[PDB]
PDB file of N, CA and C and ligand atoms in Angstrom:
ATOM      1  N   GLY A   1      21.965 209.917 192.173  1.00 46.75           N
ATOM      2  CA  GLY A   1      21.558 209.772 191.133  1.00 46.75           C
ATOM      3  C   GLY A   1      21.443 210.197 189.647  1.00 46.75           C
ATOM      4  N   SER A   2      21.063 209.372 188.511  1.00 47.09           N
ATOM      5  CA  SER A   2      20.934 210.272 186.748  1.00 47.09           C
ATOM      6  C   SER A   2      20.189 211.029 187.273  1.00 47.09           C
ATOM      7  N   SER A   3      20.368 212.265 186.430  1.00 49.33           N
ATOM      8  CA  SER A   3      20.497 213.958 185.916  1.00 49.33           C
ATOM      9  C   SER A   3      20.364 214.128 184.699  1.00 49.33           C
ATOM     10  N   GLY A   4      18.926 214.754 184.906  1.00 49.69           N
ATOM     11  CA  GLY A   4      18.292 214.939 183.258  1.00 49.69           C
ATOM     12  C   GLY A   4      17.339 213.377 182.541  1.00 49.69           C
ATOM     13  N   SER A   5      17.067 213.849 181.720  1.00 50.57           N
ATOM     14  CA  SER A   5      16.886 212.588 180.906  1.00 50.57           C
ATOM     15  C   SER A   5      17.178 212.189 179.146  1.00 50.57           C
ATOM     16  N   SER A   6      18.533 213.151 179.915  1.00 48.29           N
ATOM     17  CA  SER A   6      18.898 213.660 177.629  1.00 48.29           C
ATOM     18  C   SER A   6      19.192 211.756 176.630  1.00 48.29           C
ATOM     19  N   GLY A   7      17.817 211.706 176.320  1.00 49.16           N
ATOM     20  CA  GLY A   7      17.613 210.885 175.054  1.00 49.16           C
ATOM     21  C   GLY A   7      17.794 210.852 173.710  1.00 49.16           C
ATOM     22  N   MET A   8      16.605 212.239 173.772  1.00 45.36           N
ATOM     23  CA  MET A   8      16.872 212.175 172.216  1.00 45.36           C
ATOM     24  C   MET A   8      16.015 211.354 171.340  1.00 45.36           C
ATOM     25  N   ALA A   9      15.103 210.809 171.867  1.00 45.84           N
ATOM     26  CA  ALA A   9      14.838 209.250 170.350  1.00 45.84           C
ATOM     27  C   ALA A   9      12.839 209.829 171.291  1.00 45.84           C
ATOM     28  N   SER A  10      11.895 208.018 170.540  1.00 44.53           N
ATOM     29  CA  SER A  10      10.479 208.835 170.613  1.00 44.53           C
ATOM     30  C   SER A  10      10.484 208.208 171.233  1.00 44.53           C
ATOM     31  N   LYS A  11       9.258 209.090 171.304  1.00 45.84           N
ATOM     32  CA  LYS A  11       8.288 207.153 172.847  1.00 45.84           C
ATOM     33  C   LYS A  11       8.070 206.424 172.124  1.00 45.84           C
ATOM     34  N   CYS A  12       7.104 204.933 173.201  1.00 43.61           N
ATOM     35  CA  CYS A  12       7.260 203.628 172.901  1.00 43.61           C
ATOM     36  C   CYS A  12       5.872 203.565 173.319  1.00 43.61           C
ATOM     37  N   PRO A  13       4.753 202.939 171.707  1.00 44.61           N
ATOM     38  CA  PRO A  13       3.932 202.753 172.458  1.00 44.61           C
ATOM     39  C   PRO A  13       3.150 201.533 172.694  1.00 44.61           C
ATOM     40  N   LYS A  14       4.484 201.080 173.454  1.00 43.05           N
ATOM     41  CA  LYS A  14       3.941 200.090 174.567  1.00 43.05           C
ATOM     42  C   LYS A  14       4.179 200.225 175.759  1.00 43.05           C
ATOM     43  N   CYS A  15       5.069 200.990 176.125  1.00 40.19           N
ATOM     44  CA  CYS A  15       5.135 201.473 177.919  1.00 40.19           C
ATOM     45  C   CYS A  15       5.905 203.432 177.738  1.00 40.19           C
ATOM     46  N   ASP A  16       5.705 203.563 176.480  1.00 39.31           N
ATOM     47  CA  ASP A  16       5.526 205.406 176.627  1.00 39.31           C
ATOM     48  C   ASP A  16       6.432 205.672 177.109  1.00 39.31           C
ATOM     49  N   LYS A  17       8.083 204.866 177.171  1.00 43.64           N
ATOM     50  CA  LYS A  17       9.651 205.759 177.046  1.00 43.64           C
ATOM     51  C   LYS A  17      10.331 206.190 176.329  1.00 43.64           C
ATOM     52  N   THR A  18      10.965 206.504 176.634  1.00 48.18           N
ATOM     53  CA  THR A  18      12.794 206.944 175.898  1.00 48.18           C
ATOM     54  C   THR A  18      13.383 205.931 175.087  1.00 48.18           C
ATOM     55  N   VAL A  19      12.216 204.947 173.428  1.00 46.04           N
ATOM     56  CA  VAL A  19      13.432 204.681 173.414  1.00 46.04           C
ATOM     57  C   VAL A  19      15.003 205.328 172.635  1.00 46.04           C
ATOM     58  N   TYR A  20      16.307 203.914 174.053  1.00 48.15           N
ATOM     59  CA  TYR A  20      17.142 203.914 173.577  1.00 48.15           C
ATOM     60  C   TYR A  20      18.168 203.617 171.967  1.00 48.15           C
ATOM     61  N   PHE A  21      18.072 204.588 171.380  1.00 49.60           N
ATOM     62  CA  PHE A  21      19.014 205.103 170.176  1.00 49.60           C
ATOM     63  C   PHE A  21      19.869 202.659 170.081  1.00 49.60           C
ATOM     64  N   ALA A  22      20.005 203.488 171.194  1.00 48.67           N
ATOM     65  CA  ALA A  22      21.260 201.206 172.379  1.00 48.67           C
ATOM     66  C   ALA A  22      19.879 199.976 171.720  1.00 48.67           C
ATOM     67  N   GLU A  23      18.813 200.258 171.933  1.00 44.80           N
ATOM     68  CA  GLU A  23      17.707 199.092 171.779  1.00 44.80           C
ATOM     69  C   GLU A  23      16.474 199.959 171.262  1.00 44.80           C
ATOM     70  N   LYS A  24      16.939 200.463 170.364  1.00 44.00           N
ATOM     71  CA  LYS A  24      16.325 201.383 169.182  1.00 44.00           C
ATOM     72  C   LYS A  24      15.803 200.170 168.141  1.00 44.00           C
ATOM     73  N   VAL A  25      13.913 199.502 167.833  1.00 42.28           N
ATOM     74  CA  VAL A  25      13.675 199.590 167.178  1.00 42.28           C
ATOM     75  C   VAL A  25      13.069 200.003 166.185  1.00 42.28           C
ATOM     76  N   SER A  26      13.255 199.558 164.846  1.00 40.60           N
ATOM     77  CA  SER A  26      11.696 200.241 163.961  1.00 40.60           C
ATOM     78  C   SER A  26      11.073 198.807 163.884  1.00 40.60           C
ATOM     79  N   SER A  27       9.388 199.855 163.124  1.00 37.13           N
ATOM     80  CA  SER A  27       9.280 198.523 163.157  1.00 37.13           C
ATOM     81  C   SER A  27       7.176 198.970 162.962  1.00 37.13           C
ATOM     82  N   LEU A  28       7.258 199.411 162.343  1.00 37.42           N
ATOM     83  CA  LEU A  28       5.495 199.867 161.719  1.00 37.42           C
ATOM     84  C   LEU A  28       5.709 200.986 161.957  1.00 37.42           C
ATOM     85  N   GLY A  29       7.109 202.060 161.753  1.00 35.03           N
ATOM     86  CA  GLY A  29       7.206 202.942 161.587  1.00 35.03           C
ATOM     87  C   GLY A  29       6.576 203.333 162.398  1.00 35.03           C
ATOM     88  N   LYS A  30       7.499 202.322 163.883  1.00 38.76           N
ATOM     89  CA  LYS A  30       7.473 203.189 164.959  1.00 38.76           C
ATOM     90  C   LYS A  30       8.342 203.342 165.794  1.00 38.76           C
ATOM     91  N   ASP A  31       9.044 203.542 167.356  1.00 37.00           N
ATOM     92  CA  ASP A  31      10.191 202.647 167.441  1.00 37.00           C
ATOM     93  C   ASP A  31       9.320 202.266 169.883  1.00 37.00           C
ATOM     94  N   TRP A  32       9.251 200.858 169.829  1.00 37.20           N
ATOM     95  CA  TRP A  32       9.882 200.009 170.088  1.00 37.20           C
ATOM     96  C   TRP A  32      10.537 199.462 171.471  1.00 37.20           C
ATOM     97  N   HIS A  33       9.945 198.620 171.904  1.00 39.16           N
ATOM     98  CA  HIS A  33      11.762 197.755 173.130  1.00 39.16           C
ATOM     99  C   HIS A  33      11.664 196.765 172.305  1.00 39.16           C
ATOM    100  N   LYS A  34      13.147 196.768 172.444  1.00 39.98           N
ATOM    101  CA  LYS A  34      13.530 194.477 172.491  1.00 39.98           C
ATOM    102  C   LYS A  34      12.637 193.707 173.262  1.00 39.98           C
ATOM    103  N   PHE A  35      12.345 194.722 174.299  1.00 38.95           N
ATOM    104  CA  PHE A  35      11.594 194.484 175.340  1.00 38.95           C
ATOM    105  C   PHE A  35       9.703 194.098 175.728  1.00 38.95           C
ATOM    106  N   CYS A  36       9.281 195.458 174.265  1.00 34.74           N
ATOM    107  CA  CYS A  36       8.386 195.077 174.333  1.00 34.74           C
ATOM    108  C   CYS A  36       7.279 195.291 172.913  1.00 34.74           C
ATOM    109  N   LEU A  37       8.895 194.248 172.106  1.00 34.97           N
ATOM    110  CA  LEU A  37       8.040 193.790 171.216  1.00 34.97           C
ATOM    111  C   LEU A  37       7.919 192.202 171.367  1.00 34.97           C
ATOM    112  N   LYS A  38       6.871 191.931 172.027  1.00 34.65           N
ATOM    113  CA  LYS A  38       6.464 190.580 171.886  1.00 34.65           C
ATOM    114  C   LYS A  38       4.709 190.413 172.083  1.00 34.65           C
ATOM    115  N   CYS A  39       4.603 189.902 171.659  1.00 38.81           N
ATOM    116  CA  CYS A  39       3.053 189.946 171.545  1.00 38.81           C
ATOM    117  C   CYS A  39       1.901 189.506 172.835  1.00 38.81           C
ATOM    118  N   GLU A  40       0.729 189.656 172.549  1.00 36.36           N
ATOM    119  CA  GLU A  40      -0.046 189.910 174.342  1.00 36.36           C
ATOM    120  C   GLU A  40      -1.215 188.348 174.058  1.00 36.36           C
ATOM    121  N   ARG A  41      -1.273 187.847 173.042  1.00 36.30           N
ATOM    122  CA  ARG A  41      -2.046 187.004 173.171  1.00 36.30           C
ATOM    123  C   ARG A  41      -0.996 185.720 172.484  1.00 36.30           C
ATOM    124  N   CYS A  42      -0.459 185.216 171.831  1.00 34.88           N
ATOM    125  CA  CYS A  42      -0.036 184.663 171.781  1.00 34.88           C
ATOM    126  C   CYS A  42       1.631 184.051 172.736  1.00 34.88           C
ATOM    127  N   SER A  43       2.058 185.256 172.525  1.00 35.95           N
ATOM    128  CA  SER A  43       3.030 185.901 173.105  1.00 35.95           C
ATOM    129  C   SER A  43       4.531 185.388 172.571  1.00 35.95           C
ATOM    130  N   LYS A  44       4.322 185.311 171.637  1.00 32.86           N
ATOM    131  CA  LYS A  44       5.802 184.608 171.107  1.00 32.86           C
ATOM    132  C   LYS A  44       6.909 185.371 170.789  1.00 32.86           C
ATOM    133  N   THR A  45       8.054 185.390 170.444  1.00 32.68           N
ATOM    134  CA  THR A  45       9.014 186.637 169.646  1.00 32.68           C
ATOM    135  C   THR A  45       8.700 187.022 168.269  1.00 32.68           C
ATOM    136  N   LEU A  46       7.901 188.128 167.749  1.00 29.38           N
ATOM    137  CA  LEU A  46       7.960 188.236 166.874  1.00 29.38           C
ATOM    138  C   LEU A  46       9.135 189.401 166.375  1.00 29.38           C
ATOM    139  N   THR A  47       8.564 189.347 165.151  1.00 29.01           N
ATOM    140  CA  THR A  47       9.979 189.933 164.275  1.00 29.01           C
ATOM    141  C   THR A  47       9.455 191.633 164.012  1.00 29.01           C
ATOM    142  N   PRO A  48      10.897 192.809 163.865  1.00 29.44           N
ATOM    143  CA  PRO A  48      10.178 194.257 163.498  1.00 29.44           C
ATOM    144  C   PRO A  48      10.345 194.488 162.619  1.00 29.44           C
ATOM    145  N   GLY A  49       9.078 194.927 161.884  1.00 32.23           N
ATOM    146  CA  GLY A  49       8.805 195.463 160.567  1.00 32.23           C
ATOM    147  C   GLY A  49       7.819 193.575 159.427  1.00 32.23           C
ATOM    148  N   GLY A  50       6.633 194.021 160.713  1.00 31.98           N
ATOM    149  CA  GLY A  50       6.479 192.098 159.763  1.00 31.98           C
ATOM    150  C   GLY A  50       5.930 191.463 160.777  1.00 31.98           C
ATOM    151  N   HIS A  51       4.297 192.870 161.187  1.00 32.66           N
ATOM    152  CA  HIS A  51       3.463 192.369 161.910  1.00 32.66           C
ATOM    153  C   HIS A  51       2.605 192.645 161.670  1.00 32.66           C
ATOM    154  N   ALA A  52       1.111 192.732 162.772  1.00 33.99           N
ATOM    155  CA  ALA A  52      -0.073 193.776 162.616  1.00 33.99           C
ATOM    156  C   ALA A  52       0.590 194.233 163.706  1.00 33.99           C
ATOM    157  N   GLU A  53      -0.312 195.439 164.204  1.00 31.61           N
ATOM    158  CA  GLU A  53      -0.622 196.206 165.755  1.00 31.61           C
ATOM    159  C   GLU A  53      -2.613 196.504 165.555  1.00 31.61           C
ATOM    160  N   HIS A  54      -3.245 195.910 167.369  1.00 28.34           N
ATOM    161  CA  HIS A  54      -5.161 196.855 167.111  1.00 28.34           C
ATOM    162  C   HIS A  54      -4.086 197.999 168.762  1.00 28.34           C
ATOM    163  N   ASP A  55      -4.055 198.504 168.578  1.00 30.43           N
ATOM    164  CA  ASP A  55      -5.010 199.290 169.473  1.00 30.43           C
ATOM    165  C   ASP A  55      -3.502 199.572 170.587  1.00 30.43           C
ATOM    166  N   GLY A  56      -2.993 200.113 169.045  1.00 29.14           N
ATOM    167  CA  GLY A  56      -0.929 200.449 169.987  1.00 29.14           C
ATOM    168  C   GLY A  56      -0.499 198.664 170.149  1.00 29.14           C
ATOM    169  N   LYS A  57      -1.102 198.217 170.526  1.00 27.46           N
ATOM    170  CA  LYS A  57      -0.125 196.379 170.968  1.00 27.46           C
ATOM    171  C   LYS A  57      -0.683 195.280 169.853  1.00 27.46           C
ATOM    172  N   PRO A  58       1.237 195.349 169.507  1.00 30.58           N
ATOM    173  CA  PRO A  58       1.007 194.480 167.762  1.00 30.58           C
ATOM    174  C   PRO A  58       0.514 192.336 167.950  1.00 30.58           C
ATOM    175  N   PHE A  59      -0.238 191.889 167.003  1.00 31.40           N
ATOM    176  CA  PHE A  59      -0.531 190.966 167.569  1.00 31.40           C
ATOM    177  C   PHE A  59      -0.237 190.214 165.852  1.00 31.40           C
ATOM    178  N   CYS A  60       0.030 189.143 165.841  1.00 27.45           N
ATOM    179  CA  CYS A  60       1.145 187.606 164.285  1.00 27.45           C
ATOM    180  C   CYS A  60      -0.447 188.470 163.739  1.00 27.45           C
ATOM    181  N   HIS A  61      -0.279 188.662 162.968  1.00 30.95           N
ATOM    182  CA  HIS A  61      -1.230 187.789 161.427  1.00 30.95           C
ATOM    183  C   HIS A  61      -2.345 187.629 161.593  1.00 30.95           C
ATOM    184  N   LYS A  62      -2.031 186.241 162.177  1.00 28.72           N
ATOM    185  CA  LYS A  62      -3.072 185.412 161.997  1.00 28.72           C
ATOM    186  C   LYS A  62      -2.933 183.545 162.542  1.00 28.72           C
ATOM    187  N   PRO A  63      -3.131 183.694 163.637  1.00 27.93           N
ATOM    188  CA  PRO A  63      -4.911 184.038 164.289  1.00 27.93           C
ATOM    189  C   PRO A  63      -5.124 184.692 165.126  1.00 27.93           C
ATOM    190  N   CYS A  64      -4.240 185.453 165.886  1.00 29.38           N
ATOM    191  CA  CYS A  64      -3.766 185.961 166.920  1.00 29.38           C
ATOM    192  C   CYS A  64      -5.315 187.349 166.039  1.00 29.38           C
ATOM    193  N   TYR A  65      -4.310 187.831 165.707  1.00 29.27           N
ATOM    194  CA  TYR A  65      -5.135 189.644 164.724  1.00 29.27           C
ATOM    195  C   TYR A  65      -6.821 189.210 164.945  1.00 29.27           C
ATOM    196  N   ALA A  66      -6.544 188.302 163.665  1.00 29.56           N
ATOM    197  CA  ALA A  66      -8.128 187.458 163.524  1.00 29.56           C
ATOM    198  C   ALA A  66      -9.399 187.154 163.712  1.00 29.56           C
ATOM    199  N   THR A  67      -8.937 186.390 165.713  1.00 30.83           N
ATOM    200  CA  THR A  67     -10.000 186.566 166.040  1.00 30.83           C
ATOM    201  C   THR A  67     -10.117 187.587 167.153  1.00 30.83           C
ATOM    202  N   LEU A  68      -9.270 188.723 167.338  1.00 36.37           N
ATOM    203  CA  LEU A  68      -9.327 190.170 167.795  1.00 36.37           C
ATOM    204  C   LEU A  68     -10.288 190.915 166.984  1.00 36.37           C
ATOM    205  N   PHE A  69     -10.197 190.573 165.884  1.00 38.37           N
ATOM    206  CA  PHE A  69     -11.110 191.320 164.508  1.00 38.37           C
ATOM    207  C   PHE A  69     -12.710 190.437 164.531  1.00 38.37           C
ATOM    208  N   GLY A  70     -13.219 189.626 164.931  1.00 40.35           N
ATOM    209  CA  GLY A  70     -14.231 188.612 164.152  1.00 40.35           C
ATOM    210  C   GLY A  70     -15.724 188.872 164.906  1.00 40.35           C
ATOM    211  N   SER A  71     -16.333 188.019 164.448  1.00 42.97           N
ATOM    212  CA  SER A  71     -18.228 188.709 164.529  1.00 42.97           C
ATOM    213  C   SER A  71     -18.295 187.278 165.562  1.00 42.97           C
ATOM    214  N   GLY A  72     -19.539 187.467 167.100  1.00 42.15           N
ATOM    215  CA  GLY A  72     -18.957 186.517 167.369  1.00 42.15           C
ATOM    216  C   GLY A  72     -18.292 185.563 168.132  1.00 42.15           C
ATOM    217  N   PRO A  73     -17.717 186.659 169.178  1.00 48.18           N
ATOM    218  CA  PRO A  73     -16.469 186.237 170.056  1.00 48.18           C
ATOM    219  C   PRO A  73     -17.515 185.667 170.506  1.00 48.18           C
ATOM    220  N   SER A  74     -15.841 185.394 171.954  1.00 48.81           N
ATOM    221  CA  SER A  74     -16.530 183.888 172.881  1.00 48.81           C
ATOM    222  C   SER A  74     -18.226 184.242 173.983  1.00 48.81           C
ATOM    223  N   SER A  75     -18.387 183.104 173.866  1.00 48.77           N
ATOM    224  CA  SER A  75     -18.780 183.810 174.630  1.00 48.77           C
ATOM    225  C   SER A  75     -19.886 182.104 175.270  1.00 48.77           C
ATOM    226  N   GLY A  76     -20.807 182.231 175.767  1.00 48.61           N
ATOM    227  CA  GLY A  76     -20.655 180.502 176.249  1.00 48.61           C
ATOM    228  C   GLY A  76     -20.706 179.753 176.218  1.00 48.61           C
TER     229      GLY A  76
HETATM  230 ZN1   ZN B 101       8.543 199.687 175.409  1.00 51.01          ZN
HETATM  231 ZN1   ZN B 102       0.744 186.306 168.615  1.00 51.09          ZN
END
């Protein structure tokens, strides 16, 4: 099997993995994965360098983000 983890790249705030320069995507001043760059609420293709973030996980401007950040959450 492959020996060593020669990468020389920043980790991923999604899977805490060594983002490869080949699939390296700069966004919000960080390095994510072409597969990790997917909303968790709407689960729709996002764009690197034009989205919101909360707790490390990305989220569309709204209502995605909006909801997460609001009073009187879903209940009853
Ligand atoms: Zn990742
Ligand atoms: Zn979304």
